[PDB]
């Protein structure tokens, strides 16, 4: 069978600079009769099914920016990105489309670099519905903010607290290239209501009080 | 426009079989070539198999071979694949495609023992621009469907991955809108289960 070989495995770069990726196959892609390249280059982005770049090698689908070139023939390919935006974050996989069975590269992770930027930190005390149903969950919202390595500290009565919290974050952002994160505190409605003071921080720092 | 439909969401016992359709329109189903791929999470993608509908071939890839079986149905432009002896590892995404160009939005498959538990959806409004929240926990299996309103706010909506604690999945989307939007518009936190077959909508009112 061919094997698709992909480098690099990701890359990180700022918009406006230019993106080259390797493909290579154990076999040429390259059809005798009709002289093209059955070479196939897709876009997935997070959370979206693939989508169709580049086919035969270098002919563009339509919609695809012109800044999207693909090349090569035989059993190397190349797929250029003139000028990165925000927007192409994703992972780039090239297609044996030649002969079956019509194996696919490992892929090319594309993520973005841009400037440090600070979250906007939001808290949420749990709701009345959950209190009744017999549960408690503090919920705060780190947004909009980049390197991805941010640092949540919680604190209940002035006394930091780590038992109980679940961290996520999402994907790079599309438009921005900033990160978010959820950080939720969970504990039962008597554990919640034996504290006053409930403080989510990143410093940027969020509280309440019940009072 | 060419339209590849694929079936919804599916939750499988091990050992079971499912079979998964892809229908197709907006062009000669005989004449082109049907893909199947298959996604695990975080990981790459990976060809299954083809059929032509047109005379019935149809291509495998090693792995795949028992495990998968493609079919299709002209009278209804559909094509299928059979998973059979499922087990853990044959959860995951799987997309139907007509050559390279168009992409079916892909079926979600959850191979597991366990039983469906519909979420609880709690709507959160700020302390006493605007942020506001929706917690859905306590699901199974993934994914969730969340959106707010008609899909008019999304652009600035984090939904954030789910969580996996003591075998259930929780999850939390964030909504900012400007000051003047909430609480004077009506902003509600729709939510979809379809392993549950549960819509539920919150809205988010002031404490
Ligand atoms: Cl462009
Ligand atoms: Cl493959
Ligand atoms: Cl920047
Ligand atoms: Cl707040
Ligand atoms: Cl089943
Ligand atoms: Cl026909």
């Known amino acids: 069978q061919i094997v698709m070989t992909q480098s690099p495995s990701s890359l990180t770069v700022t918009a406006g600079e230019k993106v080259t990726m390797s493909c290579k196959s154990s076999?040429?892609?390259?059809?005798?009769?009709?002289?093209?390249?059955?070479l196939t280059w897709y876009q997935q982005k997070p959370g979206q099914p693939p989508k169709l770049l580049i086919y035969?090698?270098?002919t563009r689908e339509s919609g695809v920016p012109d800044r999207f070139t693909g090349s090569g023939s035989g059993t190397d390919f190349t797929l250029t990105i003139s000028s990165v935006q925000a927007e192409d974050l994703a992972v780039y996989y090239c297609?044996?489309?030649?002969?079956?069975?019509?194996?696919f590269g490992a892929g090319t992770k594309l993520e973005l670099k841009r400037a440090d930027a600070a979250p906007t930190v939001s808290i949420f005390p749990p709701s009345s519905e959950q209190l009744t149903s017999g549960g408690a969950s503090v919920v705060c919202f780190l947004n909009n903010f980049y390197p991805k390595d941010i640092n949540v500290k919680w604190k209940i009565d002035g006394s930091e607290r780590q038992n109980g919290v679940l961290n996520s974050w999402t994907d790079q952002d599309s438009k921005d290239s900033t990160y978010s994160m959820s950080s939720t505190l969970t504990l039962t409605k008597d554990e919640y209501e034996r504290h006053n003071s409930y403080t989510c921080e990143a410093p940027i720092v969020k509280s309440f009080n019940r009072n | 426009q060419v339209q590849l439909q694929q079936s919804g969401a599916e939750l499988a016992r091990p050992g079971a079989s499912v079979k998964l359709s892809c229908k197709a329109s907006?062009?000669?189903?005989?004449?082109?070539?049907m893909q199947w791929v298959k996604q695990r999470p975080g990981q790459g993608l990976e060809w299954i198999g083809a059929?032509?509908?047109?005379?019935?071939?149809?291509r495998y890839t090693q792995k795949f071979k028992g495990k998968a079986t493609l079919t299709a149905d002209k009278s209804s432009s559909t094509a299928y694949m059979q998973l059979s002896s499922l087990a853990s590892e044959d959860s995951a995404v799987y997309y139907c495609?007509?050559?390279?160009?168009?992409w079916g939005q892909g079926t979600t498959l959850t191979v597991s023992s366990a039983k469906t538990t519909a979420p609880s959806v709690y709507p959160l409004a700020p302390v006493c621009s605007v942020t506001l929240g929706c917690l859905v926990k306590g699901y199974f299996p993934e994914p969730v469907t969340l959106t707010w309103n008609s899909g008019s706010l999304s652009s600035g909506v984090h939904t954030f991955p789910a969580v996996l604690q003591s075998d259930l999945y929780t999850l939390s989307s964030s909504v900012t809108v400007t000051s003047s939007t909430w609480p004077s518009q009506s902003i509600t936190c729709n939510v979809a289960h379809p392993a549950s077959s549960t819509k539920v909508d919150k809205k988010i009112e002031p404490r």
């Open positions: 495609a007509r050559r390279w160009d168009y």
């Open positions: 907006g062009y000669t189903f005989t004449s082109y070539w």
């Open positions: 059929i032509y509908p047109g005379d019935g071939d149809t």
């Open positions: 076999q040429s892609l390259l059809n005798s009769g009709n002289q093209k390249n059955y």
């Open positions: 035969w090698a270098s």
């Open positions: 297609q044996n489309d030649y002969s079956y069975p019509l194996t």
